[PDB]
Amino acid sequence: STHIYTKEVSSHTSPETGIWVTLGSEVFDVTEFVDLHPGGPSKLMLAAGGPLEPFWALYAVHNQSHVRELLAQYKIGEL
């Protein structure tokens, strides 16, 4: 089974709501990670409420197995 969310995810851009992102068709609630993001949370927050792809494309440091499995710990469902 799968918890399915619509892209309209876009409302989850703060702690009060939860900070969510997508990667592929997967949805992640990354609220508890953000302050630990390398260089700080503000860069990560550029992607809040939407897909990581347009941002991660410029930052190939995310293209590591450990990063992908780290993100997977925050999965909540799918689009």
Ligand code: HEM
């Ligand atoms: C939920 C989203 C994100 C997660 C889970 C994530 C996770 C990570 C992790 C684990 C690293 C360190 C990798 C390593 O050095 O081995 C990293 C580094 C970095 N991330 Fe992200 N990232 C996210 C979003 C973003 C976004 C949206 C941007 C850009 C707009 C970004 C820019 C960077 C940069 C610049 C670094 C390098 C920092 C440094 O070494 O100074 N990240 N990220």
